[PDB]
Design a protein around this ligand. Sequence first.
Ligand SMILES: COc1ccccc1[C@H](NC(=O)OC(C)(C)C)C(=O)N1CCC[C@H](C(N)=O)C1
Ligand SMILES: [Zn+2]
Length: 139
Amino acid sequence: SGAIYVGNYRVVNRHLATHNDWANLVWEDSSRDLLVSSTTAQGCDTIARCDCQTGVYYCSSRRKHYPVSFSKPSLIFVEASEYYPARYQSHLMLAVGHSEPGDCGGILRCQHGVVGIVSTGGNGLVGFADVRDLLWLDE
Ligand SMILES: COc1ccccc1[C@H](NC(=O)OC(C)(C)C)C(=O)N1CCC[C@H](C(N)=O)C1
Ligand SMILES: [Zn+2]
């Protein structure tokens, strides 16, 4: 679990969005596993606007942060789950790092700000949904 809070927006994994997120929907994209909802309070986070390929992510299943080298956002095949059919997930970055069911929502950060959130994983891999291209989150 986890979310990014920037301005009057809350960014979460679309498969973990609540009834309240959907009732305050701003934008969602199933192909990216992202959903953004509106908030009444001002958020605590800031978004990176960069091309970093290194950073640090929070791993809830270890209560620890780990450094990672990750691939640029791209279209990556993701196996079926209860949440989605087998499909290509877009804007996904992969890295070698621990993740397991329940780690979605952990933030990946570089020196410039928030890069994205955990969205997939498996067998010593961790995948992050990028948010750096969502320029409108900043206004
Ligand atoms: C962080 O996700 C990890 C990490 C390691 C191993 C497995 C997983 C997840 N698998 C998982 O939860 O499987 C269950 C439901 C328990 C059968 C995973 O990769 N998902 C599930 C949630 C939706 C994700 C997506 N963006 O399509 C893909
Ligand atoms: Zn950066």
